[PDB]
Amino acid sequence: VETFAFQAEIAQLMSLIINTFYSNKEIFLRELISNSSDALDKIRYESLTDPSKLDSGKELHINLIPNKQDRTLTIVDTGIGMTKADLINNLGTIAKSGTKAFMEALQAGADISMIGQFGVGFYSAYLVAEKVTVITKHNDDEQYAWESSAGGSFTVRTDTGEPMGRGTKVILHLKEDQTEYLEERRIKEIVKKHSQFIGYPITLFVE
Ligand SMILES: Cc1c2c(n3c1CCCNC[C@H](C)Nc1cc-3ccc1C(N)=O)CC(C)(C)CC2=O
């Protein structure tokens, strides 16, 4: 298990998301589904040039899996996945400019729901989750688990859970007062409202 410090800008962003009063938390789901859709677009594109990139799985889809016993909402996709380098440095480095611009936009009158326009929508997960675990598998790398409860650090470890083949699983460990997002009716409502036209099958599991 390796422990890393967040880039200073990202720590700032996470604190803003966690501390700012903002009732429209439901937009987190849209942002995570968007991330999945982007990752699916990417593997679909790459597979046109190299069809063997789907040897790790041909199905391109998104699953939403609520678990009331564990108080987790999981977003699973069979997208391109992320390498160790992506998890630790690449995506966070890129997120620096997006974070800066976002925080500047907020100072100018924008609101937290616009986070996606700045490429850092993933962090909206902290609107509803006390901890986020990201399990991911990219064709060119091993399966890893990234994890953070904020507070300025994250961890990365090789994952010894069930093999995924290819893709990403975002496990939201929900805050005690955000359990509405485990309810079938509520998830259905949010998907229909914000994610109606995603170009991949979204299956809402039931309990
Ligand atoms: C900016 C960002 C970040 C993450 N994703 C993106 C968003 C940046 C663009 N996403 C492309 C990659 C391939 N896919 C994804 C990336 C992210 C989340 C989910 C997916 C996912 N569901 O595949 C996750 C980590 C843990 C690296 C932290 C972070 O800074």
Q: Is 122 annotated as a binding residue?
A: yes
Q: How far apart are CA 186 and CA 188, in angstroms?
A: 5
CA distances from 66 to 45, 87, 91, 173 (A): 30, 24, 27, 10
Q: How far apart are CA 129 and CA 179, in angstroms?
A: 10
- Which run of H or E residues covers position 144? strand 143-148
| Closest ligand 1 atom to 92 CA | 30
Task: Give the method used.
Answer: X-ray
CA distances from 39 to 42, 112, 125, 130 (A): 5, 23, 17, 24
- Helices 91-107 and 8-19 cross at an angle (nearest 10°) of 50
Model resolution, angstroms: 1.6
The conformation of residue 87, written as its DSSP 8-state character, comes to: I
Long-range contact set of residues 90-99: C-beta below 8 Å, sequence gap at least 24: 92/6, 92/7, 92/10, 93/7, 94/119, 95/7, 95/9, 95/10, 95/119, 95/120, 96/7, 96/9, 96/10, 99/9, 99/10, 99/12, 99/13
- Superfamily (CATH) of domain 1-207: Histidine kinase-like ATPase, C-terminal domain (3.30.565.10)
- In sequence order, the β-bridge partners of residue 174 are 129
- Helices 27-49 and 184-194 cross at an angle (nearest 10°) of 60
| Closest ligand 1 atom to 94 CA | 1
CA of 95 from ligand 1 middle (Å) equals 9
- In sequence order, the β-bridge partners of residue 131 are 173
Yes or no: say if 28 and 175 are a contact pair by the CB < 8 Å rule.
no
